[PDB]
Paper text:
Type I RM enzymes house these activities in a multisubunit complex having ATP-dependent translocation activity that pulls thousands of duplex DNA base pairs through the stationary enzyme, eventually cleaving at random sites distant from the recognition site. Upon identification of an unmethylated specific DNA sequence, two HsdR motor subunits, which bear the endonuclease and ATP-dependent DNA translocation activities in the fully assembled DNA-HsdS-HsdM2-HsdR2 complex, start to translocate the duplex DNA toward the stationary enzyme from both directions, producing two extruded DNA loops flanking the enzyme complex. The X-ray crystal structure of the HsdR subunit with bound ATP from the Type I restriction enzyme of E. coli plasmid R124 revealed four structural and functional domains forming a planar array: one nuclease domain of PD-(E/D)xK type that houses three endonuclease active-site residues and a QxxxY motif common to the RecB-like nucleases; two RecA-like helicase domains of SF2 type that use ATP to translocate duplex DNA without unwinding; and a C-terminal α-helix-rich domain presumed to contact the HsdS-HsdM2 methylase.
The main chain can be traced for residues 217–219 in the Lys220Ala mutant, though with less confidence than in the WT or Lys220Arg structures. In these two structures the Asn221 sidechain points toward ATP and partially fills the space that in the other two structures is occupied by the sidechain of residue 220, but the Asn221 sidechain does not approach the ATP base edge closely enough to hydrogen bond as Lys220 or Arg220 can. A nearby region in 3D space, encompassing residues 181–191 (hereafter 180s loop) is resolved only in the Lys220Ala structure, and there only partially, with the backbone traced confidently through Arg182. Residues 183 to 191 can be traced with less confidence through weak electron density in both monomers of the Lys220Ala asymmetric unit. The resolvability of the 180s loop in the Lys220Ala structure appears to be related to the rotation of the helix-like segment bearing residues 220 and 221. This shift that brings Asn221 into the position of WT Lys220 places Ala220 on the opposite side of the helix-like segment, where its carbonyl group comes within hydrogen-bonding distance (3.2 Å) of the Arg182 guanidino group.
Author numbering: 12 to 139, 149 to 583, 591 to 859, 873 to 885
Write the structure that this text describes.
Amino acid sequence: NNFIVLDKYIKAEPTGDSYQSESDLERELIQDLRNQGYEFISVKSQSAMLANVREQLQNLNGVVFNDSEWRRFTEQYLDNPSDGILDKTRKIHIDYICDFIFDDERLENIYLIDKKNLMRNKVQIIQQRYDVTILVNGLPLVQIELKKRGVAIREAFNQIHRYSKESFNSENSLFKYLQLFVISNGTDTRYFANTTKRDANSFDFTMNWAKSDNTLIKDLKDFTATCFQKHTLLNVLVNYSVFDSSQTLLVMRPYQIAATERILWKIKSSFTAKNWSKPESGGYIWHTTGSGKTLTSFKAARLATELDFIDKVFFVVDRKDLDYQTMKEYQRFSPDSVNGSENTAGLKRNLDKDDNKIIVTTIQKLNNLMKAESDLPVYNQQVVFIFDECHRSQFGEAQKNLKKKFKRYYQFGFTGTPIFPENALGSETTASVFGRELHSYVITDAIRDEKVLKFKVDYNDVRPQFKSLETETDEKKLSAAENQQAFLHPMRIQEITQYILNNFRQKTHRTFPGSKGFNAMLAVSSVDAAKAYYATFKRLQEEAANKSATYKPLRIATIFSFAIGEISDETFDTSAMDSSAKEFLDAAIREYNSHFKTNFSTDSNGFQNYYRDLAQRVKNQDIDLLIVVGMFLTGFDAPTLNTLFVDKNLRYHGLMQAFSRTNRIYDATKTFGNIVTFRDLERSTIDAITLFGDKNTKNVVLEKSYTEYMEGFTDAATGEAKRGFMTVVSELEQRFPDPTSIESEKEKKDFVKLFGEYLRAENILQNYDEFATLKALQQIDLSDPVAVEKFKAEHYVDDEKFAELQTIRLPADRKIQDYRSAYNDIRDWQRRWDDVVFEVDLLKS
Ligand SMILES: Nc1ncnc2c1ncn2[C@@H]1O[C@H](COP(=O)(O)OP(=O)(O)OP(=O)(O)O)[C@@H](O)[C@H]1O
Ligand SMILES: [Mg+2]
């Protein structure tokens, strides 16, 4: 099998020589790479480098340039001056073959890399800031930054990589070819992709290499022995990196790679055994929701097409999970054939295509196809299925005619929430359908690796009158409760909507003006609910428009089309909807059109276009709040969406998938996803988490209490003590009255450590309603208690709670700015102590 993500790996042993300075780490890095087959050469210039490339490409392609021809190949294809990192990257991954016309007029195909036979490519290393650069056919595709042992790797990542887009001179030109960065202090080694567009991911996207059980490989020697094994490295560079329709480069994380290669080997081995068309031919990957199932599964599909014996590879997704970006991606492969309709024509067309393998479609369309068409030639062909998270509504019938009509097949599935006998619900189980579990990356592991955010979950109890309904467990009483007499009661909706309007900005980190921040979804129970909330938001927002011309409204959109508490599949056919809803939808689409200057109508085509454009605008924050029923709750990917407002009954897999809309990692600003619920989901939340996990999993997944973060607590998984906000406040007032107290070195560093804690803690506490109330109390009184009474009604606080809140002592507003200016004055001096990490992202706001 030759897997590059190891099942077992025996930890290496230190040479006893000094491992402290960058010189040490570099010495042994070069030594190790050299032992693993990387030739150390000396390149002191862009010219020496170019000459080396000439040798390697000539060697590789079996050809010889003259100086003229070579100058031309350099100026046009290889080192073209107009090209940036993006262009170089497209040349590495998409078009690596230059069709070159020699001076004698013949055509040769000049390869940058041999992707069929990987080990033919020449790998070698040069050195420098301490850096070791890994050259593939002379081209610098990898770079290793080395810092000393006591250096905080995050600050070192802050340093370059966000400090900013450092120019590219004429002599460093070839280094625009860099695909992959690896940074290490020897204790910890993290790798990550080179950013093309001028965006530049945060530290949260960096990752340690790992084994198939997802246990980390942290230290440079072991990282080297594994990731930098030439076979491993080249595979990461060539096969397990992705360059997509957004022109963004992504390196796959270890778990994604392991799952993928295990799928591929499963296909190969089952084929040579003639073991096709059985559950033992395929498998399922259990990758926790939001860990990249879609990236990975489609990458596996594209890779499974590279098997000589496979005629067709189906990549099928649930039309429910389609969004603007993912549709854009699939357009390049199966044009106009991936959407929310039932039509099979596009599928039939892609199916008959000379020189093609990949067939991207929806489980709906696949189902309809296999229903209606029994004579297809693809049926007797050698076929692979990759099912990305379409396990339910149309899946049963789909599987039925699958096993019926497909004679030679290997079928696989990805899910974050598997089907177990417990939650079976009429559907065959995941294990039953796909057979063995080939790999897993489970939520606790994902949280541990910080590749998925945790949740903060609270039932908002402001509503004594409606609380009986909001806590109701019986299934039949909830169905009956949809009406203006109970759940859709005007006062309930008014009060809730008022809450969302009041606390939107606080939740989304939009509070501080001159800060970008996040946005939200509201997920509701029914079409009428959506209709009511959209109605009520518009009214309440036009009311406060009169109260003030300093009132800045939120942009609100909605989308719904004709539907336990599981999530119902909505059709994309808006002809099914009753006249009331279609009237309301049309109106909102008209408002939407006039606002965004779009032309969308409500016929299925116009609605589909509405769906696409909506997704893009919610993703980029042109929409502040998306009110929804069953849409964009399962596969929608929006790293800037941090808060989900919930008036709905969500259970089990539906629960997780809905909440997981906020689970995407972004930077130190977005600490966890915010879930705010106007029905009580506590027991359902815990049920759901425990379903995929154990009794303890909920302690990892759910964020801690307000009191804990104020007074401190002890993290169970780490074992570490996380000091509370008031102990930080206390220690700031005590140890650093300031600015006089700044002075000596140690008293500076200690202040940076402490104020780091401060900024993190306060940022975390923004999301707590208690803390919002506490901070809002800091303006208020002296004279007219019109605001004092206004403060009580808005934050739902009585005279009892109000009494002690006076006593809680926070630092003066001026003192926070003294602290902040001091923090900057230190960090800047530092740019002109290895232990420390400044919070730049938290600072910037
Ligand atoms: N290796 C990677 N490097 C950088 N970013 C990644 C990587 N893998 C995934 N992501 C990002 O994480 C986000 C979520 O990925 P994706 O939607 O593919 O996950 P998912 O498991 O399908 O989520 P869901 O369970 O909600 O459908 C995407 O924006 C994706 O770009
Ligand atoms: Mg997905």
